[PDB]
Design a protein around this ligand. Structure first.
Ligand SMILES: CS(=O)(=O)c1ccc(Oc2cc(F)cc(C#N)c2)c2c1[C@H](O)[C@H](F)[C@@H]2F
Lengths: 261, 291
């Protein structure tokens, strides 16, 4: 157990080039005095923690007035997060730097009616370069009237997708179907997919639907002729698989990617 | 004498007296941190860490928490001095360890995950001892860096997920709560959903949340549910909920597993849902429900 304190001192010496600048470790008491000089020589530094936070979360700090939203201060990390000079931010109001439909959440959070040192945590869309989603956490400090001090961090047609009940009725269609089959989504939803299938190919697709269910979780790809809105049989590669609830495993829907072949 | 063991100026009414390994571990850790900070870099040291809703952690490839921000206490109870220089694995849930190990390795450097860490603070805001160690889920987002036999570091920001029962943070008009069963079916939802997404709560009760997910999102949303059940809390990614009469709204959700405290059993999943957008593509009909 004495190793711990010994490794500690060899580790300490191994952390400084002026402790590798001797033939050997000085007296253990002398080693403690030797390091005290180095530690005092030079991690509370503002500039270090700002970069730690930009490293970790890709976020910047800013202070705006609660009454007007004017940015009394913005740190220089706004340029790497949002590609916006402090020129644009400083001497402006956060309202003109966020999405028009977010100014309301913005005033709500900027309110001082009920909450001073109160916390704040919201999400908004800030203009860049287009808007980016920004998580904002902060508090409210006296202006010297009121001011939000806050951190904002950044964070991460050939076919059409459909969802079906096991019967085969479209319960979901994405907007791309108008360019692949010509139907408006509402013309497909509520109807069965076999309705738009050429009668010759109808048993093929009908068989795939049972198979995908028995072949639970797994993809199979049937190929049939699809009736367009413009009425022309279009070959269609439908790759389907089962989706099931991650708790009860009850089948939630069949998911199909209809690709014109 | 050993008065130099009362005399190390470590970054001062706490640099004076420290016990056993506290003086040394802190010092070695500080110098290693400075070594990394040189690699990254190129007054207001109190605003930055009082705005954060989490703490900053620099953890090496071995697993050493060579740097922990001063605020870890407000969220974890355990002090920066109790933990700096100690191994991440001695204060995290063991069944999370392997995940932490693959997030410490090496080539995208971005990291986003959820860990469970020991916590000796309590809901009221009063601290407790280490035998009284609860598990708190932290959303960890950061970068792994190579720095100098090159070393390797994980600079993460670790945020707690507010418990739906207890929260002193302003609730927005764009945030609404929903309760769900383990079958992901709504068992309750807020009155505001109608004003924001257009649906009355009555017509969602009994409907699984998979009915309303935009088809492009629902698998990324199962993975988030499979991590909320494994770990008890989660933050979702941005997702689309189909609106009542065409369209979709953007949402982010903090999920929490709620335990019946009499039988110690999973009763429901409470979800705090954040509306990020207005109805988008209301002209477009996606679902049979919205017709
Ligand atoms: C993954 S999550 O953030 O916790 C989540 C996020 C949203 C959840 O349900 C919701 C709640 C809501 F307001 C809109 C939608 C949609 N679309 C789904 C659910 C969850 C959980 O799955 C819980 F089981 C439930 F399924």
């Amino acid at each position: 157990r004495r190793n711990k304190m010994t490794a500690y001192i060899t580790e300490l010496s191994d952390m400084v080039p002026t402790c590798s600048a001797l033939a050997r470790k000085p007296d253990k008491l002398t080693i403690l005095r030797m390091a005290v000089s180095h530690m005092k020589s030079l991690f509370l530094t503002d500039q270090e923690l700002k970069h730690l936070i930009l490293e970790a979360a890709d976020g910047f700090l800013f202070i705006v007035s609660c009454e007007t939203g004017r940015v009394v201060y913005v740190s220089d990390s706004v340029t790497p997060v949002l590609n916006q000079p402090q020129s644009e931010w400083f001497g402006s109001t956060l309202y003109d730097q966020v999405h028009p439909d977010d100014v309301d959440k913005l005033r709500e959070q900027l309110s001082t009616s009920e909450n001073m040192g109160s916390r704040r945590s919201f999400i908004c869309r800030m203009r860049c370069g287009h808007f980016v989603v920004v998580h904002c956490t902060g508090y409210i400090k006296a202006w010297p009237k009121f001011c939000l001090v806050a951190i904002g961090r950044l964070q991460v047609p050939t076919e059409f997708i459909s969802r079906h009940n096991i019967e085969g009725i479209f319960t979901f269609v994405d907007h791309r179907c108008v360019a692949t089959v010509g139907y408006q989504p509402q013309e497909l939803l509520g109807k069965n997919i076999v309705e738009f299938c050429h009668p010759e190919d109808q048993q093929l697709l009908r068989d795939s639907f049972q198979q995908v269910v028995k072949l639970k979780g797994q993809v199979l790809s049937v190929m049939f002729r699809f009736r367009s809105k413009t009425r022309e049989w279009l070959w269609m590669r439908t790759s389907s698989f089962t989706f099931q609830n991650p708790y009860s495993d009850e089948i939630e829907y069949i998911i199909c990617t209809n690709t014109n072949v | 004498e050993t008065e130099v063991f009362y005399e190390l100026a470590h970054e001062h009414s706490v640099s004076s007296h420290l016990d056993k390994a506290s003086i040394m571990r802190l010092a070695i850790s500080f110098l290693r941190t400075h070594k990394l900070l040189s690699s990254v870099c190129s007054q207001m040291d109190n605003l930055y860490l009082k705005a954060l809703e989490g703490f900053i952690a620099v953890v090496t490839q071995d697993g050493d928490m060579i740097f922990l921000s001063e605020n870890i206490s407000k969220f974890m109870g355990l002090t920066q001095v109790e933990l700096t220089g100690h191994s991440i694995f001695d204060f995290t849930h063991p069944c999370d360890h392997e995940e932490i190990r693959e997030n410490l390795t090496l080539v995208s450097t971005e990291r986003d995950f959820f860990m469970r860490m020991k916590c000796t603070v309590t809901n009221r805001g009063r601290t407790v001892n280490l035998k009284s160690a609860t598990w708190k889920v932290l959303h960890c987002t950061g970068q792994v860096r190579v720095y100098n036999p090159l070393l390797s570091c994980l600079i993460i920001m670790c945020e707690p997920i507010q418990h739906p029962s207890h929260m002193d943070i302003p609730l927005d008009s764009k945030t609404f709560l929903s309760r769900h069963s383990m079958d992901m079916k709504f068992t309750y939802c807020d009155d505001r959903i109608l004003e924001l997404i257009g649906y009355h709560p009555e017509e969602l009760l009994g409907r699984s949340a998979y009915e309303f997910y935009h088809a492009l999102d629902s698998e990324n949303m199962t993975k988030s549910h499979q991590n909320l059940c494994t770990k008890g809390q989660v933050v979702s990614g941005q997702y689309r909920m189909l609106a009542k009469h065409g369209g979709y709204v953007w949402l982010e959700t903090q999920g929490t597993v709620i335990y019946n405290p009499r039988n110690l059993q999973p009763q429901c999943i409470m979800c705090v849902n954040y509306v990020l957008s207005e109805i988008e593509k209301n002209d477009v009909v996606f679902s049979m429900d919205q017709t």
